[PDB]
Design an enzyme around this catalytic site. Structure first.
Site, short mmCIF file in Angstrom:
data_model
loop_
_atom_site.label_atom_id
_atom_site.label_comp_id
_atom_site.label_asym_id
_atom_site.label_seq_id
_atom_site.Cartn_x
_atom_site.Cartn_y
_atom_site.Cartn_z
CG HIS A 62 -0.62 -0.13 2.57
ND1 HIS A 62 -0.75 -1.46 3.04
CD2 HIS A 62 -0.09 0.83 3.38
CE1 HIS A 62 -0.23 -1.46 4.24
NE2 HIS A 62 -0.01 -0.22 4.58
CG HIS A 117 1.44 10.22 7.35
ND1 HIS A 117 0.26 9.80 7.02
CD2 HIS A 117 1.08 11.63 7.02
CE1 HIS A 117 -0.60 10.43 6.46
NE2 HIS A 117 -0.32 11.68 6.52
ZN LIG Z 1 0.19 7.95 6.35
#
Ligand SMILES: [Zn+2]
EC number: 4.2.1.1
Length: 258
Positions: A62, A117
């Site tokens: 992903h 992130h």
């Molecule tokens: Zn993320």
């Protein structure tokens, strides 16, 4: 079947297997800059990454994760709206098929080319797995990427992508310093939210940096060459692995600046 970003297993389908998808503290959200409340009680963030130990980079189907040694307090985040120490476990990105989209979060509805992130877990819970079950278990620092000049510090990352092109591949990835990915300013927005991929647990204190970093077109290009699929399966380019903005509901976005 299993979740992804395609038409048949995309974000709009996630609630069937992860009901929390329609929860009250889902992420990402749109940051309305004129509704965000300046809060002078918020402290400056403290990023201590000088002892950061990266170990590996992995294609999980992903995104790609760069993993760090979190066995000790080597790379931590504290301060800001946080109580306690949060240890860096991994970082990954969300990106698009075109420069006009890719970020999870949006600012005044503006989408960025990508979003980094940096994932941290609250040391009081002893391990990552217990941390995700708590309302204050994780701290995620979000950094927007816009296309412009190359980011020198991202280049060691860009260059190893060829070697983890498909799902399940991994490569040794030692001595990478995540300080090369920070913008100059640490001004931020903060709100209580969740992971942006299944299992979508509502255990995140989001810290979104106001200032974007720039990457070159050629750098983001390399991201788009990865695959969602495993080796020997039909090629599906890993692109658009972002979730649309979710309702804010009963939450307030606070700003560390004005
Ligand atoms: Zn993320």
């Amino acid at each position: 079947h299993h979740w992804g970003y395609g038409k048949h297993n995309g974000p709009e389908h996630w609630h069937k297997d992860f009901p929390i998808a329609k929860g009250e503290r889902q992420s990402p959200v749109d940051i309305d800059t004129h509704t965000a409340k300046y809060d002078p009680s918020l402290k400056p963030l403290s990023v201590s990454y000088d002892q950061a130990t990266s170990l590996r980079i992995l294609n999980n189907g992903h995104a790609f994760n760069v993993e760090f040694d979190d066995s000790q307090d080597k790379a931590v985040l504290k301060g800001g709206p946080l109580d306690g120490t949060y240890r860096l476990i991994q970082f990954h990105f969300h990106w698009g098929s075109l420069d006009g989209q890719g970020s999870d979060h949006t600012v005044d509805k503006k989408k960025y080319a990508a979003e980094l992130h940096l994932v941290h877990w609250n040391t009081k819970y002893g391990d990552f797995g217990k941390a995700v079950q708590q309302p204050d278990g994780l701290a995620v620092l979000g950094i927007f990427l816009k296309v412009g000049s190359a980011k020198p510090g991202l280049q060691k990352v860009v260059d190893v992508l060829d070697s983890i092109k498909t799902k399940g591949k991994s490569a040794d990835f030692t001595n990478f310093d995540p300080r090369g990915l920070l913008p100059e300013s640490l001004d931020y927005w903060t709100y209580p939210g969740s992971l942006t991929t299944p299992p979508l647990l509502e255990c995140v204190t989001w810290i979104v940096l106001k200032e974007p970093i720039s990457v070159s077109s050629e750098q983001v290009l390399k991201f788009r060459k990865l695959n969602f699929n495993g080796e020997g399966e039909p090629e599906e380019l890993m692109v658009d692995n972002w979730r649309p903005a979710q309702p804010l509901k009963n939450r307030q976005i606070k700003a560390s600046f004005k």
